[PDB]
Amino acid sequence: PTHLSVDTKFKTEGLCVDIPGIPKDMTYRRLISMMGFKMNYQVNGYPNMFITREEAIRHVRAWIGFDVEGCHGTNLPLQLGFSTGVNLVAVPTPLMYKGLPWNVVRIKIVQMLSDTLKNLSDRVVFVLWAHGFELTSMKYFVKIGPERTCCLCDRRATCFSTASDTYACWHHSIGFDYVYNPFMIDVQQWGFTGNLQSNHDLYCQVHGNAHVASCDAIMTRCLAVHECFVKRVDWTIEYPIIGDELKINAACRKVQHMVVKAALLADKFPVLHDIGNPKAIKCVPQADVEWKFYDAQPCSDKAYKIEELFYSHSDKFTDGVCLFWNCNVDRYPANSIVCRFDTRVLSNLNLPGCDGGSLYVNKHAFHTPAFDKSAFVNLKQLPFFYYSDSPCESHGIDYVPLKSATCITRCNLGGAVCRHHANEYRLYLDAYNMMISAGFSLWVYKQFDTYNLWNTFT
Ligand SMILES: C[n+]1cn([C@@H]2O[C@H](COP(=O)(O)OP(=O)(O)OP(=O)(O)OC[C@H]3O[C@@H](n4cnc5c(=O)[nH]c(N)nc54)[C@H](O)[C@@H]3O)[C@@H](O)[C@H]2O)c2nc(N)[nH]c(=O)c21
Ligand SMILES: [Zn+2]
Ligand SMILES: [Zn+2]
Ligand SMILES: [Zn+2]
């Protein structure tokens, strides 16, 4: 039950306009052969060009929307659209390219897919709203066969070159002309009513329809992300490490302990309303504050309404401070400590999402509602600072003397930062800059002032 059986039925009603007379009874085995490919009875790791809904979710980083529109069927040009926004015109002789024969179009496709996916996934999953021409055009730039490894490394092969008769992954595909062993999935097979635009526009207002192939490719992938990461959520699926996931997660927990501990020392809140992950633990377990938890799973569609979270416990969320660490609400109260992911940040962990949101894949997949500046009108941006009440003692690196107005320590209060707190300062600054560059923003109540922390050294 792992892979999609090649004898599974395939609904061809969406194909009968480009391909009139197509059989109603159709399997993937008869469809792959129809597309011009031969499986030759194979058990070499490539059982089907099409993958399941579950298998596609585990390879979401490889999703590339793909659509082909008749520009004017072997006798007419074809407009190739990809969710990267690229439009290629192939002739049988937001960016748009002029018409060119297939032998040079396939070279651009290998280059475009490789630069997109080399730091993301080991494969490519062509997300389709299939109507005919996109399946029949793959024979001009897709070659299938047994699973192979790269000729320059041990990654699996994703490209093939007719010049050298060799194979390569996304990293070493310069000069290659064919996509080797790709995967694909037809969203239209999931049982929708209506066309692509009517179904996409039910949940997203950001992607329009300029009647170009790439617009449909973007809407197709967007509709797929909504069905797999907005309407349905699966937090049990783990995703491989492809970047600084571990340092970013560790930096977020390092900053959270620093910020919440300092806010409790500076303002002496009697109560703390920790609103967010239902499995959360005290990030400052040594604090005197009364810690009250409120369960709320990460929202994947729209940001929570602060009215429905609070108003319907201590119930007096105006007492003490409220902690919204990656708990996206529409408008945070004035007595809040907030960590909110910026969906606009470009990174290999953050994928384009639905209706302004993004899909942040770090160990797990979190579809995050679109970043809204108006949510922080009652708060201010949290400035960088480093606080430490630990003993100014170095145990165990080369020391350039540290001078910083944001090093809240006894040694800095005394006019000279010690080597221990200087190491921890520069380590915390690296973690802070790691967290901010990853896309997380920090916000705090306007009364927060690091000048109140100097007095805890008395
Ligand atoms: C809720 N949320 C978080 N972020 C961010 O996304 C990343 C995923 O981290 P994560 O939540 O997968 O794990 P940690 O917090 O490191 O786990 P931890 O504190 O360790 O809690 C225990 C869990 O982690 C596991 N775990 C515990 N210790 C470790 C460890 O040392 N290493 C690893 N790899 N896992 C550990 C443990 O088995 C359990 O699954 C982080 O940057 C989050 O801030 C969000 N970002 C967006 N856009 N939207 C969200 O809704 C959102
Ligand atoms: Zn390679
Ligand atoms: Zn959309
Ligand atoms: Zn010190």
Author numbering: 24 to 95, 102 to 122, 151 to 369, 373 to 456, 463 to 524
From the publication, what sentences describe this entry?
We have determined the structure of NSP14 in complex with cap analogue 7MeGpppG, and observe conformational changes within a SAM/SAH interacting loop that plays a key role in viral mRNA capping offering new insights into MTase activity. As was the case for regions of the N-terminal NSP10 interacting regions, several regions are observed interchange secondary structure elements with residues 363–366 forming a short section of helix rather than forming an additional sixth strand on the central MTase β-sheet. This loop conformation would not appear to be compatible with binding of SAM or SAH in the same manner as previously reported as the new loop conformation significantly overlaps with the adenine moiety. Consistent with this, attempts to soak either SAH or SAM to our crystals did not give any convincing electron density. On the other hand, the cap binding site appears to be open and we were able to soak in a cap analogue 7MeGpppG which gave clear electron density despite a slightly lower overall resolution. The 7MeGpppG has both methylated and un-methylated guanine moieties and as such is both a substrate and product mimic. The electron density map shows a clear bulge in the position of the methylated N7 and the methyl group is buried fairly deep within the pocket and makes Van der Waals interactions with P355. The rest of the guanine moiety stacks against F426 and N386 and makes polar interactions with T428 and D388 in a similar manner to that described previously for SARS-CoV NSP14(5). Other elements of the 7MeGpppG binding pose are less similar to previous structures, the second and third phosphates taking a slightly different path and forming polar contacts to K423 and R310. The ribose and nucleobase of the base 1 (adenine in the case of the SARS NSP14 but guanine for our structure) is significantly less well ordered in the electron density map and is modeled in a position where it makes polar contacts to K423. The ribose O3 of the first nucleotide is in a solvent exposed position such that it would be possible to be incorporated into the NSP14 active site in the context of a full RNA cap molecule.
